[PDB]
Design a protein around this ligand. Sequence first.
Ligand SMILES: O=C(O)CNC(=O)C(=O)O
Ligand SMILES: [Mg+2]
Ligand code: NI
Ligand SMILES: [Zn+2]
Length: 331
Amino acid sequence: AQNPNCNIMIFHPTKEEFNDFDKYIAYMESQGAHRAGLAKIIPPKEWKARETYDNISEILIATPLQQVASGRAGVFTQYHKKKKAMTVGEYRHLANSKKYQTPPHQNFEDLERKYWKNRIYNSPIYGADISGSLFDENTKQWNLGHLGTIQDLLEKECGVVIEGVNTPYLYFGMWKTTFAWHTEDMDLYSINYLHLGEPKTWYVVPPEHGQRLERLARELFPGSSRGCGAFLRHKVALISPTVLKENGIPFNRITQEAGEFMVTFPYGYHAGFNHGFNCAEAINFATPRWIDYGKMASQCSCGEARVTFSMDAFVRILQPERYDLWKRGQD
Ligand SMILES: O=C(O)CNC(=O)C(=O)O
Ligand SMILES: [Mg+2]
Ligand code: NI
Ligand SMILES: [Zn+2]
């Protein structure tokens, strides 16, 4: 069995190996990459996502989110308070202000220490889930706006034609902006490209150990657990590496820098934070190996998780028994 300790693997494809996306994903899995839940892909040196980022300031963040924390430093929830619209140029200036900017630090480890010590005492503003792309249309390799769609994968594998579309999303971050512990909708893959700016630190639990994280989360967030049998789908709960180590949960960590891709694999729980002003692009995708994970994915039916139009069909075809109750949650 390849990668039996479930370490995060890092890949350096050549320009020739960068042509066929599906084939490279299947290669990475042949080497065991999926066992970690997360992999890093460093693009060939010849490749570029676009020529420059000099003209992005007029993108609108229509609903910036202020991430307000509650709890203790290592075990907290966050709620998202909606703020007034602002441009990317305005958001960048805000990120760089004395109130919100990255503090002085020695290296990524010192910054990680400061994040876990101090996150709860501040409320950084995140521009999340903005439909759009920063890949140039002429970029033919690993262009997250030109991937094969999940609806077409389900059709190729299972023969059933369904409605829905699959498009990318932009994330504009600042120091302390936080992504809570989650897997993807329907336990899909994700791919994330850091277009510009400061790094993003990731934490991940191997898929084969995801239920260990779920059981800890039910202990640590006991009212949320009683409210919903899949409450990590709400994307609000944080648990620090120190707490995970104290409770024996297997995990790994890695820092993504500008110019690098990360892939999350089906049922790989992940969480993390941004080091300073940055812009990432991400999208979900599927392969043949995902289909069995989709059939088994938990669902939020309490009504909190409220998700895309396209997830309807996935539930309807892969989880017909749940369909009824899950749709009660979504209406
Ligand atoms: O970058 C972020 O804020 C969160 N992204 C992801 O969870 C992802 O790509 O799967
Ligand atoms: Mg612009
Ligand atoms: Ni994710
Ligand atoms: Zn719920």
